[PDB]
Amino acid sequence: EIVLRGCAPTPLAAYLKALGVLRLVCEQVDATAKGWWQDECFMLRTRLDDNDLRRFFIEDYRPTPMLSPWNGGSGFYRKGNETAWSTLEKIITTQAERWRPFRDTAEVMADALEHLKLTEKPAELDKRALLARLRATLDDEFLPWLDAAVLLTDDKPDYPPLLGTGGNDGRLDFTSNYMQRLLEMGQFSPGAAGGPNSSTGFDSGAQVNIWDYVLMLEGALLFAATATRRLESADPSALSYPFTVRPSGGGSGAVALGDERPARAEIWMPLWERPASLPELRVLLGEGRVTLNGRLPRDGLDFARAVAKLGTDRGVRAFQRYAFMMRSGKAYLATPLNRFHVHRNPKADLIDQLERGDWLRRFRRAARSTHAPARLQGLAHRLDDALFDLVRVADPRRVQEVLKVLGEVQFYLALSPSLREQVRPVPRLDAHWVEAARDDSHEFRVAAALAGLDDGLPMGVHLAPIDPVKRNVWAPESRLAVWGQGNLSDNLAQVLQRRLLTASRTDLNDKPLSGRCPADEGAVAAFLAGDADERRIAELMAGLACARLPARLPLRQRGASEASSLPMIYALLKPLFVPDAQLREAAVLTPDGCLPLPPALPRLLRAGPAGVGRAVDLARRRRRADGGRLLAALMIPVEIRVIKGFIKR
């Protein structure tokens, strides 16, 4: 038994790579070999060893002739570029035994395309005709790629999501890249080329592990021809692979609603407990029958509920959920998702407001109405998914998802008078939706700066019973919970004192006060000027401290507060507080070696205008070597350029 530790169940590329390895090993001589998940890895049972497997792939492995005239992938297309032609010519000018299938397939597809007699490209009806001809002229080893990439249908074509627009993205195809990688030996992987989700420091010329890509495309072929329509209702309607439903952003976290709304599809990949041979996997991945029962599982939540019911059969231990998300652009990425569960939740109480006047029920009751096309039913399904996700995970982006689906529903209903008649006027909801919903004002930036501390300890350990190890759970004990109520300055002062005490007891000389969702000089000025809303800042900070912090929300900022109303005393005192690392980076004359804030300074600041004068005298004396709001402002995290600006002044 071989452990393919280069493969973990994620990303989707790795799962497909495992399937491709198993498929190739089985098909080519080792038919009854078996392949199952274990140890965060794929397991293979075969009479190949590691060395036999490597020799197989290096010296004998015939790749599947992935060539697609149904898109720009046969090697013969009007719109294209030179490298692809050079590649295809080199492959056609082969006579190697390993390349024979590619030559035959390319010749056949060229002949079919010529038989189309095109100007530049064929149309949808012509696409179906071309697919039929290719099916009638290809051979056994090619047809799995045809079945995976494209469909033959009664009324209109539709493109399976796993391979984009039919093995194609935009106006170009995966087959040319596949060929180029082979000779060296779009939508492919977020682990290599994902949207901004992790710490920075990477660059490449659109590079990918070539074996990963090849084996991924090889494994994608196990998704078979039984991707039929849901014979439901009475007009042309849903087509999909097995295990396919649209995605919901429960547990997504490092994802934005601008990508959820256009999400192409969601696919649930089974994981299983014992070695499984290829034909059983073909049955499993061909049927994947989660499509039934008149209120169809259009989206992921119904799939999850079926899993909970064991409606998705046992033997499959788990499903790895993947969402094809549009990364605010022209491309879709197969984003993996981590797992959360239905349980008690304070933000879930928000949903009760939607139950006022029974609105939600009425809306749901209206959704089936077929005079509203499948769109209304799909929106109702999406709303149910978003609400269940809100119950599962208390996160501002889930609240935003619910609000966005509600807005889309409202727009759709506004376009339909008959539907407008069927639901009574909406009940009043409470302001807590908004406060949990998106915020990004000066209040929000100050709150996120205060909440987004990253010296190990999150701000939660002060505002709530929290510990850094479990940031969205009933966590272990980090005992700094000294927060309070009402106006924000006193509670921030208490947090500063407790952080200084914790630093002294840990003996952290550099105060743990660095934050990485910072405010700005304008936000700090608005706070200091006496005009910003303190209470909303406090509530937003408490909310933001609740969970594992996401990559970042869509930031949409606002202008600074300044009209001859921004003091210098803040600049005089700030260098005494800033994390020493940062300060040392900062020009300030003050020492570099780290420091627990000069002993008496916070108390003097809290002692009022006379106390502020004493604090200024003390700061002057140390640098040679009104209060409360000023202290709270001094706590706010901001970046080094502001400190440089201060020093210049």
Residue numbers in the entry: 9 to 193, 227 to 666, 682 to 705
Publication excerpt:
Here, we report the composition, structure and function of the type I-G Cascade CRISPR effector from Thioalkalivibrio sulfidiphilus, revealing key new molecular details. The unique Csb2 subunit processes pre-crRNA, remaining bound to the 3′ end of the mature crRNA, and seven Cas7 subunits form the backbone of the effector. Structural analysis by cryo-Electron Microscopy reveals a strikingly curved backbone conformation with Cas8g spanning the belly of the structure.
The large subunit of type I-G systems has no detectable sequence identity to any other Cas8 protein. Thus, structure predictions suggest that Cas8g is a highly divergent member of the Cas8 family with a C-terminal Cas11-like domain. A poorly defined elongated density that runs across the belly of the Cas7-crRNA crescent complex structure was observed in our CryoEM reconstruction. The density resembled a bi-lobed structure with a larger head closer to the 5′ crRNA end and with predominant interactions with the first two Cas7 proteins. The enhanced map enabled us to model the Cas8g subunit using the AF2 predicted structure as starting model. We separated the N- and C-terminal into separate rigid bodies and using DockEM we modelled the overall structure of the bound Cas8g protein. The Cas8g subunit is clearly flexible and consequently is observed at only low resolution. The N-terminal domain of Cas8g sits a considerable distance from the 5′ end of the crRNA, and this together with the lack of a Cas5 subunit represents a significant point of divergence from the other structures.
